[PDB]
Amino acid sequence: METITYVFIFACIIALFFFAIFFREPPRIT
Amino acid sequence: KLPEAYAIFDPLVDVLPVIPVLFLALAFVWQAAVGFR
């Protein structure tokens, strides 16, 4: 169970990365 | 040892290798002279 848990958290972070790059709030020039 | 003829120059010879560092220092004495224009 502990291996699954460490792997799951690591895998959530990689998915965070993807959304934070590709689905960021686009910076725009007000 | 040096050749015994040049023994009286042993202490000159001990200090000679550091002379190139004094050139670097001399450049700063010089720019201080010209006020770092």
Next chain:
Amino acid sequence: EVIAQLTMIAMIGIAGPMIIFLLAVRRGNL
């Protein structure tokens, strides 16, 4: 012995600043 060493390097060392000094008096081309 070491006064020999220190007296040589005393003279060699001041040699540089003196050049700068002389060239200032003559309003040399510093």
Next chain:
Amino acid sequence: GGRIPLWIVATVAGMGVIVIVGLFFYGAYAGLGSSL
């Protein structure tokens, strides 16, 4: 107020520290603290 040029005091003062420090490294090899 400025009779001695700054570039001179700099050189004098520098070679003064160089000496003091130079001496401290000498003492690292002589007398107390030299392992001898």
Next chain:
Amino acid sequence: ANLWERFCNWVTSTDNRLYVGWFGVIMIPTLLAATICFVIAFIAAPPVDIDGIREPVSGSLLYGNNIITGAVVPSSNAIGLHFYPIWEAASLDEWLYNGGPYQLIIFHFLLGASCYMGRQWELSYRLGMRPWICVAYSAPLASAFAVFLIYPIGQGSFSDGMPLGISGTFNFMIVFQAEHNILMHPFHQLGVAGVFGGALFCAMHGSLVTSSLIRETTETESANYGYKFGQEEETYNIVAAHGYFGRLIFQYASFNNSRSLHFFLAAWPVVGVWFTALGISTMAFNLNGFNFNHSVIDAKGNVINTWADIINRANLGMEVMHERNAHNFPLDLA
């Protein structure tokens, strides 16, 4: 145009969400191969005989590790500095036993991060920027080359390279202290100044700029909305930050030129970390930290211990226990 020109134009395009570039053509494959191997070895690779003494160290999560203890283990001392590609093994099983993943990961990683650095230059050229961010990155890059490549070379073995793990790194640091007295090495003292000072100046700059933010918001909204992206004008009063900080210390220990202040921020940590990467890189060749062991003695000749001698007793503790089964002869000469 022709096909090669379309490709060149896509490769170097400043309109791609992530810049690719010529350096990026080498970086992408090499970083991907390093990362995939690393993730899979960290989770599933079987024990590795790091020290070449048929005494395998388990590094992976499935063989009873956690995040803190796990590692990709350096390759066998029996291999030394020999190249150990997968295809030089008789089987994957032999490759896993002898630590091949480590070689594959660090070489692809060093290459990709070398090209990460060149990519930084390259994108800055396409954008019309000044080019020296990549110089800044050279400090961390140089550091990584030291623990993963230079130090193996000096010592004859990638088995003495820094492990890819949290506890493996600590192992590396302790052993390094016993064999090199890195704490007594000025280049590491310069590294610590680099990173303590880096953090100091980081906190200072952030605190000082934040102190002098221009009232542009109400007390119920984040002050951060006082800044609008791209905006022409500055959002803090540097004159005010100087006036505060010059009084904190004195007027000329404080910066009033923003460019000189930011160049100082860049240079202080970068230089310090260069020195500490040079520290590892020259201790790789056994020019070690200062040795003041039994340096003070009394008129008779008894040793009068100093803090250096106390450090040396710790060092000896690390020396005599590390790799406890790998020494047959009395001096640990590599």
Next chain:
Amino acid sequence: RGWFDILDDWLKRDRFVFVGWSGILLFPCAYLALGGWLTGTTFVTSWYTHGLASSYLEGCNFLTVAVSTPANSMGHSLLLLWGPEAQGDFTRWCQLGGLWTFIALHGAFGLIGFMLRQFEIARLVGVRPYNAIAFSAPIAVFVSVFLIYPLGQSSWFFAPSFGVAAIFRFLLFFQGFHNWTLNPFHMMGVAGVLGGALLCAIHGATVENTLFQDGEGASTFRAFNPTQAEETYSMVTANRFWSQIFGIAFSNKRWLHFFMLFVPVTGLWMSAIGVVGLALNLRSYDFISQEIRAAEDPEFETFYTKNLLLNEGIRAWMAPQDQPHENFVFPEEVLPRGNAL
């Protein structure tokens, strides 16, 4: 104008070195922390407290001089010069370690003074006091390491001695007895310091490499007027660079400098907390699961077990001389050692 008001006037005068009310605390305690350090690393021994030399006078160099902690037998005494131990005798005070408490406590009140000075100057100039707030992390470190940690231990003996190599010894003590590298509070502190160093370097380099051409010479420093309105570098080109190089980028200058404050300040605070634990020997020393397996399975080895073996060598090899007051006698045959070495 009352006399308090006239004294305010003079203390808050614009001079080369601002004084303030906070000065009355800051300058005297700071000078004496500094002074007693210089004095004590130049002239004072650790022979009676530690069995060590520790001054230039004895032949130590800049790296090995220390003002060393008082003997363990003093407990947590304040070691006042006029107190029961030294009884007003200056020489005996120096010899029993009084300069350590002198430095420790004058330094503490000087740090107070400095933070108040940060507050006092902020108020008069009219800026927000985020710098004083940032100074709270150095104070948490100093208090945790130098005061709280020994107060939980047997005596001031085990606080840090004020010296370059004395501090290195402290580092290694903490590895061998506390396994402090394994401690998550230290790990967060490492992240904040190395991360702050990172922010420091990357921010400085970005500004330097996105500058606008505001002059015509190759020395770019002279194209900045502290009173100009305009940003001196391009946030927009900075953002695009890092967006395409690293995938994300700052877009907000305020948040960026607030983050620079936050990261190293929060990291030192986290490390302070771990040291408060260690005051009590409440360490993250072991992983129980690894130990139960290792005890039962002689073929199970990890970097975690390899490091404890090193810890074990540090403790036994260094303790007799590092804690002389314990009169530890370890025969050769009990010393842990691997093969040959």
Next chain:
Amino acid sequence: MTILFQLALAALVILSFVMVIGVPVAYASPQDWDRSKQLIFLGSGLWIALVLVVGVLNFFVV
């Protein structure tokens, strides 16, 4: 001729020592490009001769 080689040798050294300070001051002083042309061109041949003379004397003492 032992003492005669030490003669030439400190000649070299007391000539180098002059030529070292003198040549750069001579050069960056505007006054005497010509008043000092002869000086340096002489000390030069003098320097060289001294080196050569010391070079042959070595093989009579060293």
Next chain:
Amino acid sequence: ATNRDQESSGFAWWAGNARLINLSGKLLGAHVAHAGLIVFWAGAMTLFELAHFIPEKPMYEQGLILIPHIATLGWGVGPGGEVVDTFPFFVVGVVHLISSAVLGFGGVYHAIRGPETLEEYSSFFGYDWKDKNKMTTILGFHLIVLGIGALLLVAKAMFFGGLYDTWAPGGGDVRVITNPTLDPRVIFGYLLKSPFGGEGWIVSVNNLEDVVGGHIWIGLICIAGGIWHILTTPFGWARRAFIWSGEAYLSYSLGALSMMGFIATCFVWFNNTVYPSEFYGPTGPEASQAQAMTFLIRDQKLGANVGSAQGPTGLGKYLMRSPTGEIIFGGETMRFWDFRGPWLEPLRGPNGLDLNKIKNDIQPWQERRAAEYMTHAPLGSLNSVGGVATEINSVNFVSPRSWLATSHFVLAFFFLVGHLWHAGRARAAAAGFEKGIDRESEPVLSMPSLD
């Protein structure tokens, strides 16, 4: 104000040597004067080493880095590297040092008196950085000069007394080379060797024939390239690939020098042919192999059968197999089994170390060398306490190999930084945005958003 201040030249004092970029005559003086400094140091240092040199101590016990370079060239040395005539050291010393003064003189003249710029005084010496024909011609001249230099080494080896040959029997001796290796299968086989363990790229060159023959090829290669470039102009492809500027050429050479310092570093660390251990002390690998040899010898004398002794791990305590089966020394030194040295190769057989030779044929000179080398391993502290980091003060030693390898790694690293700095700047300056971004035409502002 002939440049020489910041208002006119655009560079501040701390980058004042960039004021010289387009002052060919002052720039010529800076280089000659600086060459002066290099040849001065060769001269002062050698004499310094001579004054401090005791011929009865090994070179490596006395902090010497330049005299070992002279000894390797075959001067002043006899069998086993014994010093037999110090006079040549003196000569190298004085001649360089004398020579520094003429160099000295020439640089200070050009940097002060002479024309600041050369291009109107004589059309041959003056140059424009952007003249692609003039640059390749200077390159060609220097190429030829280098090629000659390489052939000077060949001349010393073949016609003028030979080179120290650590592999020459009887324990090493100077020796004239008569059959240099010309087969380019060998000479250029070294270039295609892996730089990894057991191959060593060109660092592995282990005999003086290959060394001399490589320098015939390189000399002739440089002389032929010199002519090439003197007669040619860069082709279309090369013009479109490079930046043609003073600073870019500088960055190309900083690149080159960096690469070379790193190679030097590994040369002095691993190679015991053109850095003989007689002179430089043992290599790190050598010292560690020597330790295992020393303790093999001691225990065999006591009665140990060293081929059948199982150590604690299950591997042989003295001898084990490398991963391709060779008999090698055991213990940690298993990483060093690639080591080859004259003291050790007599025990080597077709399958590696030969147990019959180990049981019968170890001579006292091998025992001595192995003990000497084990106790001059290149470990020491920065203040020159010899040994491991935990050693007590007493032995005042740091191996020349450590000094030469650490100094040149440091140097090669900073010269790679220099490359990146100046290459980057040269590209920016050529594109015209090295002073910053043009507010009125900011490039990113004319680009579409990423998202």
Next chain:
Amino acid sequence: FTFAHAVFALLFFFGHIWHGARTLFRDVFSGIDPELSPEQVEWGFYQKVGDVTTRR
């Protein structure tokens, strides 16, 4: 008990600093005055730091 309270005491020091500053600097919590001149922060203009009444 001891661990938690010493830890909590330490953190609460930081809250004292945070809330103390916000009381004494409430006026500029949202930012510094956008119309503040160097006569007020630069050196010498005022004999007492901050006091506009101290010209020259």
